[PDB]
């Protein structure tokens, strides 16, 4: 059991760590364009803010699946039951 | 001469060269645009 349990900690760190890395860079790109449009046309902000949340759902979709699988591998373990 | 009315022409001298919440999407740089528009403005005043 020792190496399967030790390698499950690294598997969880890669799932949450790569997800945290991508989501921070992704929102930095999407966010900068929201502020740029908002500064040029301050009347458009109500529309642009709603359109940003439609993209934010697509951007985090696979990252949240990764965090869901990482919590499952932490509080339960599908590999330990396979010896 | 300036047209005051059909019976009065006034001689005049007018200065040509020495002249709010949103901004334009300047296609070329704004400096390049200002250089061309000031020239079109002075020519139009001379034509008028």
UniProtKB/Swiss-Prot annotation, chain A:
Where does the record say this protein resides?
Cell inner membrane
- Give a GO cellular-component term: proton-transporting ATP synthase complex
The GO terms this record gives for MF are:
lipid binding; proton-transporting ATP synthase activity, rotational mechanism
Q: Please tell me the species this chain comes from.
A: Pseudomonas paraeruginosa (strain DSM 24068 / PA7) (Pseudomonas aeruginosa (strain PA7))
What does the similarity note say?
Belongs to the ATPase C chain family.
Q: Does the keyword Cell inner membrane apply?
A: yes
Designated name of the protein? ATP synthase subunit c
Q: How does the annotation summarize its subunit structure?
A: F-type ATPases have 2 components, F(1) - the catalytic core - and F(0) - the membrane proton channel. F(1) has five subunits: alpha(3), beta(3), gamma(1), delta(1), epsilon(1). F(0) has three main subunits: a(1), b(2) and c(10-14). The alpha and beta chains form an alternating ring which encloses part of the gamma chain. F(1) is attached to F(0) by a central stalk formed by the gamma and epsilon chains, while a peripheral stalk is formed by the delta and b chains.
Q: Does the keyword Cell membrane apply?
A: yes
The domain of life is Bacteria
- Function of the molecule: F(1)F(0) ATP synthase produces ATP from ADP in the presence of a proton or sodium gradient. F-type ATPases consist of two structural domains, F(1) containing the extramembraneous catalytic core and F(0) containing the membrane proton channel, linked together by a central stalk and a peripheral stalk. During catalysis, ATP synthesis in the catalytic domain of F(1) is coupled via a rotary mechanism of the central stalk subunits to proton translocation. Key component of the F(0) channel; it plays a direct role in translocation across the membrane. A homomeric c-ring of between 10-14 subunits forms the central stalk rotor element with the F(1) delta and epsilon subunits.
From the UniProt record, report the name of the gene that encodes this protein.
atpE
Instruction: Kindly give the InterPro entries that the UniProt entry links to this protein.
Output: ATP_synth_csu_bac/chlpt (IPR005953), ATP_synth_F0_csu (IPR000454), ATP_synth_F0_csu_DDCD_BS (IPR020537), ATP_synth_F0_csu_sf (IPR038662), ATPase_proteolipid_c-like_dom (IPR002379), F/V-ATP_Csub_sf (IPR035921)
Which keywords annotate this record? ATP synthesis, Cell inner membrane, Cell membrane, CF(0), Hydrogen ion transport, Ion transport, Lipid-binding, Membrane, Transmembrane, Transmembrane helix, Transport
Residue ranges crossing the lipid bilayer per the database entry? 10-30, 53-73
Its record classes its membrane topology as: Multi-pass membrane protein
The site feature described as Reversibly protonated during proton transport is recorded at 60
From Swiss-Prot, chain B:
Where found in the cell? Cell inner membrane
Q: Which domain of life is it from?
A: Bacteria
Leader peptide range in chain numbering: none
Give a short account of what the protein does.
Produces ATP from ADP in the presence of a proton gradient across the membrane. The gamma chain is believed to be important in regulating ATPase activity and the flow of protons through the CF(0) complex.
Partners and quaternary state? F-type ATPases have 2 components, CF(1) - the catalytic core - and CF(0) - the membrane proton channel. CF(1) has five subunits: alpha(3), beta(3), gamma(1), delta(1), epsilon(1). CF(0) has three main subunits: a, b and c.
The record's similarity note reads: Belongs to the ATPase gamma chain family.
Identify this protein by name: ATP synthase gamma chain
Q: Which organism is it from?
A: Pseudomonas paraeruginosa (strain DSM 24068 / PA7)
The beginning of the lineage is: Bacteria, Pseudomonadati, Pseudomonadota, Gammaproteobacteria, Pseudomonadales
Full-length numbering of the shown residues? 173 to 229 of 286
């Amino acid at each position: 059991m020792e190496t399967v349990v030790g390698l499950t900690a690294i598997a969880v760190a890669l799932l949450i760590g790569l997800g945290a890395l991508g989501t921070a860079i992704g929102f930095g790109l999407l966010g900068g364009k929201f502020l740029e449009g908002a500064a040029r046309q301050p009347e458009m902000v109500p529309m642009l803010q709603v359109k940003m949340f439609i993209v934010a759902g697509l951007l985090d979709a696979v990252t949240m699946i990764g965090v869901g699988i990482a919590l499952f591998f932490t509080f339960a373990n599908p590999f330990v039951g396979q010896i | 001469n300036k047209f005051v009315n059909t019976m009065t022409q006034k001689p005049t001298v007018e200065q040509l060269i020495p002249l709010h919440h949103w901004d334009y999407l300047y296609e070329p740089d704004a400096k390049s645009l200002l250089d061309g528009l000031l020239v079109r403005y002075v020519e139009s005043q001379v034509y008028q």
